[PDB]
Scaffold this active site. Structure first.
Site, short mmCIF file in Angstrom:
data_model
loop_
_atom_site.label_atom_id
_atom_site.label_comp_id
_atom_site.label_asym_id
_atom_site.label_seq_id
_atom_site.Cartn_x
_atom_site.Cartn_y
_atom_site.Cartn_z
N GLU A 1 75.32 115.61 154.53
CA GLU A 1 76.05 115.96 153.32
C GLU A 1 77.04 117.08 153.65
O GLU A 1 76.64 118.11 154.21
CB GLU A 1 75.09 116.42 152.23
CG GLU A 1 75.78 116.60 150.89
CD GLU A 1 74.82 116.93 149.77
OE1 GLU A 1 74.79 116.17 148.77
OE2 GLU A 1 74.14 117.97 149.84
N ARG B 1 72.57 111.64 150.72
CA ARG B 1 73.14 111.44 149.41
C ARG B 1 74.42 110.58 149.47
O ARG B 1 74.85 110.17 150.55
CB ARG B 1 73.41 112.76 148.70
CG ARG B 1 72.16 113.55 148.38
CD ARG B 1 72.49 114.39 147.17
NE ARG B 1 71.36 115.20 146.76
CZ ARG B 1 71.28 116.51 146.98
NH1 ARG B 1 72.26 117.14 147.61
NH2 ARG B 1 70.22 117.18 146.58
C1 LIG Z 1 73.33 123.52 146.42
C2 LIG Z 1 74.75 124.13 146.44
C3 LIG Z 1 75.66 123.45 145.39
C4 LIG Z 1 75.42 124.03 143.96
S1 LIG Z 1 75.67 125.57 143.50
C5 LIG Z 1 75.23 125.37 141.95
C6 LIG Z 1 75.18 126.34 141.03
C7 LIG Z 1 75.30 127.68 141.39
C8 LIG Z 1 75.24 128.71 140.45
C9 LIG Z 1 75.03 128.38 139.12
O1 LIG Z 1 74.95 129.29 138.11
C10 LIG Z 1 75.21 130.65 138.50
C11 LIG Z 1 74.90 127.04 138.76
O2 LIG Z 1 74.70 126.81 137.46
C12 LIG Z 1 75.12 125.53 136.94
C13 LIG Z 1 74.91 125.55 135.40
N1 LIG Z 1 73.73 126.35 135.00
S2 LIG Z 1 72.60 125.45 134.07
C14 LIG Z 1 70.91 126.00 134.30
O3 LIG Z 1 72.63 123.97 134.49
O4 LIG Z 1 73.02 125.62 132.60
C15 LIG Z 1 74.96 126.02 139.70
N2 LIG Z 1 74.87 124.09 141.77
C16 LIG Z 1 74.99 123.34 142.89
C17 LIG Z 1 74.67 121.83 142.92
S3 LIG Z 1 76.07 120.73 142.43
C18 LIG Z 1 76.30 119.59 143.79
N3 LIG Z 1 77.07 118.49 143.68
C19 LIG Z 1 77.22 117.61 144.69
N4 LIG Z 1 77.97 116.54 144.52
C20 LIG Z 1 76.60 117.84 145.91
C21 LIG Z 1 75.81 119.00 145.99
N5 LIG Z 1 75.15 119.34 147.09
N6 LIG Z 1 75.68 119.82 144.94
#
Ligand SMILES: CCCc1sc(-c2ccc(OC)c(OCCNS(C)(=O)=O)c2)nc1CSc1nc(N)cc(N)n1
Ligand SMILES: CCCc1sc(-c2ccc(OC)c(OCCNS(C)(=O)=O)c2)nc1CSc1nc(N)cc(N)n1
Ligand SMILES: O=c1ccn([C@@H]2O[C@H](COP(=O)(O)OP(=O)(O)O)[C@@H](O)[C@H]2O)c(=O)[nH]1
Ligand SMILES: O=c1ccn([C@@H]2O[C@H](COP(=O)(O)OP(=O)(O)O)[C@@H](O)[C@H]2O)c(=O)[nH]1
Lengths: 230, 230
Positions: B34, B98
């Site tokens: 990924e 993925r």
């Molecule tokens: C694991 C690193 C990638 C991240 S970072 C992240 C993130 C980081 C900080 C955040 O809040 C401070 C966060 O919150 C999203 C919204 N908060 S919530 C609890 O759903 O209301 C998401 N979500 C993600 C997953 S989205 C994603 N989409 C893809 N297509 C691939 C992939 N690896 N990740």
């Protein structure tokens, strides 16, 4: 065997005026309007309807998003004219209202330089733009460029001289940037690119500076002479 | 000819370890890691660190840009493997870490539901995703899916083991929703996507809560058996 010709120029310079004229002079000529215009009720419109107002309302939040959508929507309309319009004309010519290179080298670029997009937003956009515009490798590739040339001032006239609620706020200064981005790209040819055929495509400059609406014949003559060269 | 299998599961289900383990077992067996997981650890990698870092700080501002770039990077990176790798192995199989399907129906769907993408971004992305996959990603179509189903606390513990100072947060509650959306698509098979074929597409699902980096022969026996019914 279709010639593909992009018509370039500033906001309200008359590009659409010109392409509307050209389309009716030959049944072998068709026009692809630029999507941002139709935006300015399918799912592309409401979205572009939405993204355009949101961009106007706040550019440094929405420029990447708007830019990426403008270009994909352009890449999809142009693919759908070449694969639809004009089946076996003897001499087919497709006129594009602007190109994927105006999207990037004039508009996207300008927002980056206006600090309406950061380096990550600009490098990402270029990555997206460049890897993709190397996927089609000769489909959308231009045969020629025609540059309608107005003054940001001629253009400024015509923006008011033209009717759209939302556009009434565009100030003079927005235009001189795009103009120099336009003049530097299509005349002075300083502006460089990563598309190894663009520095060799020929260009037709055209003074849309005098009103050419009921006096369009010699411009159209230059166009015909130009086409014969290509 | 080259068989495409997607490895799907919650954050820290154990995808990178199972896939690293699988690739050792056979010269017919190849992998596409990924892009996102690589960015956590080249201009794409320069772009990728920053927007991930940006996406932590303000998911509400950066999710459109992250989701578009993540997916773009996966496509090209699945293509490069597909176009080159396994030309002749006897029984080539590529395992995707993925897929463009989880990009959209786990992560982006979730980001929007939780209001980090507004409505317009999400519709644009969905339009982007249809067209980007139909024009360029066609030959990436999946022969089947290995769903590595686990549970929430395991992953938090495993995030901690890895030591990744960015994720060590991730709310057990956020691990808890990503967890829930995989069942629907894969476990209960309810989610009808925009791509009809997957409905048919055979799915294997393995329970992997237990530490396996020593003991997986049973995990691999079911892969091999799954791959042969393909
Ligand atoms: C694991 C690193 C990638 C991240 S970072 C992240 C993130 C980081 C900080 C955040 O809040 C401070 C966060 O919150 C999203 C919204 N908060 S919530 C609890 O759903 O209301 C998401 N979500 C993600 C997953 S989205 C994603 N989409 C893809 N297509 C691939 C992939 N690896 N990740
Ligand atoms: C003409 C309607 C489209 C718009 S709206 C817009 C805009 C709106 C507000 C802005 O800031 C307040 C803005 O630019 C920020 C600063 N420029 S300014 C107005 O002099 O202060 C641009 N630029 C544009 C041109 S961007 C563009 N990109 C494309 N890819 C194609 C295309 N035809 N146009
Ligand atoms: O020779 C010309 C060129 C332009 N216009 C007007 O200028 C406005 C903007 O033209 P258009 O939308 O075609 O310009 P573009 O943005 O396409 O360059 C319109 O009201 C045109 O009628 C005109 O009256 N005569
Ligand atoms: O059976 C396992 C599988 C994984 N891990 C560890 O848990 C962390 C997260 O696993 P992985 O990177 O495979 O998760 P994913 O790649 O699915 O995000 C890693 O440091 C692994 O070494 C473990 O201790 N036992």
């Amino acid at each position: 065997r279709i010639k593909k010709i992009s018509i370039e120029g500033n906001i309200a310079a008359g590009k659409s005026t010109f392409v509307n004229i050209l389309k009716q002079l030959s049944e072998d000529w068709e026009v692809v309007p630029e999507p941002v215009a139709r935006w300015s009720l399918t799912m592309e419109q409401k979205n572009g309807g939405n993204v355009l107002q949101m961009m106007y309302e706040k550019p440094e939040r929405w420029s990447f998003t708007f830019q990426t959508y403008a270009c994909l929507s352009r890449i999809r309309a142009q693919l759908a004219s070449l694969n639809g319009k004009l089946k076996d004309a003897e001499k087919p010519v497709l006129f594009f209202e602007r190109s994927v290179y105006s999207d990037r080298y004039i508009f996207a670029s300008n927002l980056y330089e206006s600090e309406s997009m950061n380096e990550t937003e600009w490098t990402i956009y270029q990555d997206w733009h460049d890897w993709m515009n190397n996927q089609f490798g000769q489909s959308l590739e231009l045969d020629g460029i025609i540059y309608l040339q107005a003054t940001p001032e001629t253009c400024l006239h015509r923006i008011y001289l033209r009717g759209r609620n939302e556009e009434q706020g565009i100030p003079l200064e927005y235009l001189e940037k795009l103009h120099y981005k336009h003049e530097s790209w299509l005349l002075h040819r300083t502006l460089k690119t990563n598309f190894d055929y663009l520095q060799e495509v020929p260009i037709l400059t055209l003074d849309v500076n005098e009103d050419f609406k009921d006096k369009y014949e010699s411009l159209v003559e230059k166009v015909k002479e130009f086409l014969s060269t290509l």
